[PDB]
Design an enzyme around this catalytic site. Structure first.
Site, PDB file in Angstrom:
ATOM      1  N   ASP A  11      28.004  73.983  33.499  1.00 20.69           N
ATOM      2  CA  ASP A  11      28.970  72.925  33.758  1.00 20.69           C
ATOM      3  C   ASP A  11      30.377  73.505  33.564  1.00 20.69           C
ATOM      4  O   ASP A  11      30.810  73.764  32.436  1.00 20.69           O
ATOM      5  CB  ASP A  11      28.690  71.736  32.840  1.00 20.69           C
ATOM      6  CG  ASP A  11      29.856  70.788  32.722  1.00 20.69           C
ATOM      7  OD1 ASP A  11      30.863  70.905  33.479  1.00 20.69           O
ATOM      8  OD2 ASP A  11      29.754  69.916  31.840  1.00 20.69           O
ATOM      9  N   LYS A  72      40.927  74.049  36.967  1.00 21.08           N
ATOM     10  CA  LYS A  72      40.094  73.218  37.824  1.00 21.08           C
ATOM     11  C   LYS A  72      40.931  72.338  38.755  1.00 21.08           C
ATOM     12  O   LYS A  72      40.567  72.107  39.912  1.00 21.08           O
ATOM     13  CB  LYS A  72      39.176  72.339  36.978  1.00 21.08           C
ATOM     14  CG  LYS A  72      37.961  71.849  37.733  1.00 21.08           C
ATOM     15  CD  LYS A  72      37.094  70.948  36.871  1.00 21.08           C
ATOM     16  CE  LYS A  72      35.890  70.452  37.649  1.00 21.08           C
ATOM     17  NZ  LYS A  72      34.774  69.962  36.770  1.00 21.08           N
ATOM     18  N   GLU A 176      28.269  66.789  39.766  1.00 13.97           N
ATOM     19  CA  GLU A 176      28.125  66.533  38.334  1.00 13.97           C
ATOM     20  C   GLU A 176      27.253  65.306  38.054  1.00 13.97           C
ATOM     21  O   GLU A 176      26.328  65.388  37.255  1.00 13.97           O
ATOM     22  CB  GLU A 176      29.499  66.462  37.626  1.00 13.97           C
ATOM     23  CG  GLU A 176      30.182  67.834  37.424  1.00 13.97           C
ATOM     24  CD  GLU A 176      31.689  67.759  37.170  1.00 13.97           C
ATOM     25  OE1 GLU A 176      32.194  66.650  36.847  1.00 13.97           O
ATOM     26  OE2 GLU A 176      32.372  68.815  37.294  1.00 13.97           O
TER      27      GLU A 176
HETATM   28  N1  LIG Z   1      32.204  62.717  19.035  1.00 18.34           N
HETATM   29  C1  LIG Z   1      33.273  62.519  19.835  1.00 18.34           C
HETATM   30  N2  LIG Z   1      34.082  61.450  19.656  1.00 18.34           N
HETATM   31  C2  LIG Z   1      35.155  61.231  20.447  1.00 18.34           C
HETATM   32  N3  LIG Z   1      35.515  62.039  21.466  1.00 18.34           N
HETATM   33  C3  LIG Z   1      34.787  63.139  21.750  1.00 18.34           C
HETATM   34  C4  LIG Z   1      33.601  63.449  20.938  1.00 18.34           C
HETATM   35  N4  LIG Z   1      33.089  64.586  21.435  1.00 18.34           N
HETATM   36  C5  LIG Z   1      33.869  64.971  22.480  1.00 18.34           C
HETATM   37  N5  LIG Z   1      34.878  64.099  22.669  1.00 18.34           N
HETATM   38  C6  LIG Z   1      35.938  64.180  23.689  1.00 18.34           C
HETATM   39  O1  LIG Z   1      35.405  64.482  24.963  1.00 18.34           O
HETATM   40  C7  LIG Z   1      36.319  65.325  25.686  1.00 18.34           C
HETATM   41  C8  LIG Z   1      35.572  66.457  26.391  1.00 18.34           C
HETATM   42  O2  LIG Z   1      34.663  65.912  27.362  1.00 18.34           O
HETATM   43  P1  LIG Z   1      33.513  66.841  28.012  1.00 18.34           P
HETATM   44  O3  LIG Z   1      32.590  66.063  28.943  1.00 18.34           O
HETATM   45  O4  LIG Z   1      32.888  67.622  26.876  1.00 18.34           O
HETATM   46  O5  LIG Z   1      34.381  67.941  28.826  1.00 18.34           O
HETATM   47  P2  LIG Z   1      34.960  67.802  30.317  1.00 18.34           P
HETATM   48  O6  LIG Z   1      35.647  66.451  30.293  1.00 18.34           O
HETATM   49  O7  LIG Z   1      35.846  69.024  30.454  1.00 18.34           O
HETATM   50  O8  LIG Z   1      33.747  67.822  31.213  1.00 18.34           O
HETATM   51  C9  LIG Z   1      37.380  65.807  24.708  1.00 18.34           C
HETATM   52  O9  LIG Z   1      38.613  65.120  24.955  1.00 18.34           O
HETATM   53  C10 LIG Z   1      36.844  65.344  23.366  1.00 18.34           C
HETATM   54  O10 LIG Z   1      37.883  64.916  22.478  1.00 18.34           O
HETATM   55 MG   LIG Z   2      33.053  66.720  32.594  1.00 17.02          MG
END
Ligand SMILES: Nc1ncnc2c1ncn2[C@@H]1O[C@H](COP(=O)(O)OP(=O)(O)O)[C@@H](O)[C@H]1O
Ligand SMILES: [Mg+2]
Ligand SMILES: Nc1ncnc2c1ncn2[C@@H]1O[C@H](COP(=O)(O)OP(=O)(O)O)[C@@H](O)[C@H]1O
Ligand SMILES: [Mg+2]
Lengths: 551, 551
Positions: A11, A72, A176
């Protein structure tokens, strides 16, 4: 022999990236060197070296202009695209114009250099790959990579290009949300028509997708959301809230010290995470500004209120998505939470309230689901060679010894270091001549340690590793050489042999043919001839399968 | 049912060839077995087999006299043409005189044999065809082939002949620059007069064409360039430059070892390509001469300077082309880059500088544009049967199973192998008699494996495949038989039936009529009668369309 080498699922995220592998009947989401199951999509450049992932995101405050993120958003776009120009005023790194292609421009070891967004991304990919290879104990070439459903032909191709740079064979670029559903087995459980909604709240973006799946075929019905609504914005709120409290309680402004701001921002990142599994979160920083400690707390309730507008705004894209599909809320059978921000109880509650207290699919870690799906589909595509009668003569057992010593790309090579290593080369070619293979390997290791950037070193060591029935080890050395110089012919010749030694038929035919173009060998030529019928029977069978699923 | 079988578009090049297909709203440029989207126009002959494309170009250094290239230059010309005689002193293969027709004369399995340039070319075509059939999963008969605009009636007909040999139905021979414009949709976007210039820098030749397109009709206004200016000449420069450096640095001459020269030349080919997307290119060869390694680099700037005269010389033909059209530089609306050498930033810059920094059309891969255009026009000609009420009774769904096992043309048939296969024939005709069709197919496969050169084997297996509702499979077997012996009547009878089974109306009427001439069947006779009204309504409608576009 053990299993063939697995294909990985990746991913490639705007804010984080994540890799998984399917083995022994289950997906493993792979942890990186620093212990995290997801890696910031960050690349940093500095006086001495290149940094990738967590190390890159951590030193940002120190080196804001040569720390690249959000590649990205640039990927697959024209410098003239209004989105790019809109975006450029929020980033602190430089973006330049190169024939209507955008390139990020940085300082990197006292020289200015620039990089296409596919190049930045390929640096992230590489890291993911490396993470997987460390887990698995062997080199990986095959991957599935995911993209947002709204990605045009241009952005898709560009994402495949980045994979190809990082040395991956890209099996499929998949959506996705499609990856998420595959993870929840929404393709193989069903024997009828079911409609599916993917609520994706990530770090930078919010994606709502409604998909229809009959007969095991995914079709995208609608897409929406906000390409600028993410977890990173909530951090803004917390940061803004605390700066203002700091003024109030401690009678000082902190906006202008960048280092104090980040320290606050990262403290806030952690705090927001704790507020997902706790009603309250404490916040301590030793010496924030001019020697003043900041000890304070915050509640879930309060955090919710600061992000009030933001959280509520994720229902409009839901509304609009059903509206594009011509569907009522009642008509969706499956609701799926993905994205790391969907860990937030409020964001969960708001959605469930729109679907009248109905159950959400969240058993699979919301930030791991996309990579999870990608790994499953990687396993199926590789798995396809089960159905074929492939003759496995000449294939040997995978070598499992620990990775040999490589170079250090960025370590200082002295003038004398060039010669001492140069002699060692000649001394090792003598041990190969005479027939003592380990001695030849050992002196190449002394040669490589002393000159980590001569590509023939690695190729020649790889030759010896092959004679020694250690193809993985050879693949490693060839991987390195081809990185240093993708044009030299030797490494393709020996990686071909190594792959063939392992039953990696399509990989062997690519290298052996490329080796034969650059520098014809009778041996490699026959290896290739011997190898072709296997590769094309596999390739023909995978292509057929994909055609059946293109309908 | 799925789509009908597509028609392919083929660019038959002097140095490389390229094939594309139009499907699902877009052109796919098709990759060959070795992974490349273009194939060297090379045919080689040896002690044991015939080699085509990359495999032929790669072993050249080993077998220079029986490795044929540049057949395009001979095609359609008289042995007495000064161009041919001028050309003959640069090639290392033998050209002979056959009634004022030139034939290339080679060694091929210890016997001397000779080939018309249309025959050499038909071997390339076949390969292209085969590349497409592997991609598509089914036999292809219909094609569009491209030629240079300066090609006379003689060379055009000769190029069509080569197609006919390779088993293609040539729908249209079209101009290379015309193909390029079709690719850029310069025919369908415009609702007014626009003038167009095609700057074609290939491997052997340089072509400048100015075309006018109103009402969707192409007209050639001027042609020029140099039939001996190409990428292959730049390779000469690099090669010449490096031999001389090798003398300087390593105190040895290498001109006389042919194998060391090629190794250098191919290294230079790659290097030149890298110099298109990099300012510098590294160049490593293991053991070049008498055991001496050659490690060296080169810059873009330096490469440019070595080809100084050559690059600059592409503006004169531009100057002359406008001059023949009676046009000023300002008067051309569209500039189009095609040919693989137009990938060279210098060659790009020089042209843009002549048109005062104006934008070039290069979004479509410059070495793929001609084939691209050819595929689009192939799709239109086939597409023409949409407008007609054609009754589709008796047509069945295309069979998609993997290609059955064929022979091996060049494998050694023993005396005992003739009998064992001969028995199997009789054993399989018994399974057909009795009514077990797969058994009949299975024992024919054992018969064919053992005797790959008896043409009745393939025809009879094709008969069984038809009874089994697998026409594609039959078409394959008939294709092979007709290759072995174009005079036997059986294969035309069964390919006719197979085509008819698939709605290939014009193809069915050709075969069924040819089968009826050679060997009258009541059945085939009625098949043909039943088939004619469809074929002639299609043929009449395509002819009308072409007449409208001949004006
Ligand atoms: N336990 C959690 N509580 C609140 N926010 C979270 C938690 N875990 C991840 N996040 C938030 O999710 C975001 C990342 O999303 P993710 O799906 O992992 O990556 P992307 O958005 O790049 O695909 C970050 O902003 C992070 O702060
Ligand atoms: Mg994502
Ligand atoms: N990226 C590149 N950089 C420089 N030269 C290239 C590149 N790609 C192809 N070429 C050159 O283009 C030539 C082939 O041109 P092409 O149009 O593909 O074939 P043809 O001229 O036979 O139609 C070769 O000489 C090759 O070296
Ligand atoms: Mg050409």
């Amino acid at each position: 022999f053990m299993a063939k080498a697995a294909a990985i699922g990746i991913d490639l995220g705007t804010t984080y990236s994540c890799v998984g592998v399917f083995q022994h009947g289950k997906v493993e989401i792979i942890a990186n060197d620093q212990g995290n199951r997801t890696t910031p999509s960050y690349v940093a450049f500095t006086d001495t070296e290149r940094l990738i992932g967590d190390a890159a995101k951590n030193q940002v405050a120190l080196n804001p202009q040569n720390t690249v993120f959000d590649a990205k958003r640039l990927i697959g776009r024209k410098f003239g695209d209004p989105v790019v120009q809109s975006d450029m005023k929020h980033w602190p790194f430089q973006v330049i114009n190169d024939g209507d292609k955008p390139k990020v421009q940085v300082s990197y070891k006292g020289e200015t250099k620039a990089f296409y967004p596919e190049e930045i991304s390929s640096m992230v990919l590489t890291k993911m790959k490396e993470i997987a290879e460390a887990y698995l104990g062997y080199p990986v070439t095959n991957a599935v990579i995911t993209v947002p459903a709204y990605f045009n032909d241009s952005q898709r191709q560009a994402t495949k290009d980045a994979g190809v740079i990082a040395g991956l064979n890209v099996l499929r670029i998949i959506n996705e949300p499609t990856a998420a559903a595959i993870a929840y087995g929404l393709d193989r459980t069903g024997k009828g028509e079911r409609n599916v909604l993917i609520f994706d709240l990530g770090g930078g973006t919010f994606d709502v997708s409604i998909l229809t799946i009959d007969d095991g075929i995914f079709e995208v019905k609608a897409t929406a959301g906000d390409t600028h609504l993410g977890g990173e914005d909530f951090d803004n709120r917390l940061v803004n809230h605390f700066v203002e409290e700091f003024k109030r309680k401690h009678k000082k402004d902190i906006s202008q010290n960048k280092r104090a701001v980040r320290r606050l921002r990262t403290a806030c990142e952690r705090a927001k995470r704790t507020l997902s599994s706790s009603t309250q979160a404490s916040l301590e920083i030793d010496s924030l500004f001019e020697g003043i400690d900041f000890y304070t707390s915050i509640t879930r309730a309060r955090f919710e209120e600061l992000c009030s507008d933001l959280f509520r705004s994720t229902l409009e894209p839901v509304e609009k998505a059903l509206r594009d599909a011509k569907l009522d809320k009642a008509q969706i059978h499956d609701l799926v939470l993905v994205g790391g921000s969907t860990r937030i109880p409020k964001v969960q509650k708001l959605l469930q309230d729109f679907f009248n207290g109905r159950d959400l699919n969240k058993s699979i870690n919301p930030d791991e689901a996309v990579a999870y799906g990608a790994a499953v589909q990687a396993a199926i595509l590789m798995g396809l060679e089960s159905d074929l009668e492939i003759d496995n003569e000449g294939v040997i057992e995978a070598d499992t010894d620990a990775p040999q010593e490589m170079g250090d790309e960025n370590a200082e090579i002295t003038e004398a270091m060039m010669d001492e290593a140069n002699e060692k080369k000649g001394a090792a070619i003598d041990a190969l001549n005479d027939g003592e293979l380990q001695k030849a390997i050992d002196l190449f290791t002394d040669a490589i340690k002393l000159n980590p950037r001569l590509a023939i070193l690695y190729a020649k060591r790889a030759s010896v590793f092959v004679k020694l029935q250690k193809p993985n080890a050879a693949i490693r050395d060839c991987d390195r050489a081809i990185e240093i110089n993708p044009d030299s012919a030797q490494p393709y010749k020996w990686r071909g042999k190594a792959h063939r030694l392992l039953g990696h038929w399509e990989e062997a035919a690519r290298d052996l043919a490329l080796a034969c173009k650059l520098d014809y060998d009778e041996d490699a030529s026959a290896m290739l001839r011997e190898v072709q019928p296997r590769a094309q029977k596999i390739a023909e069978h995978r292509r057929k399968y994909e055609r059946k699923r293109e309908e």
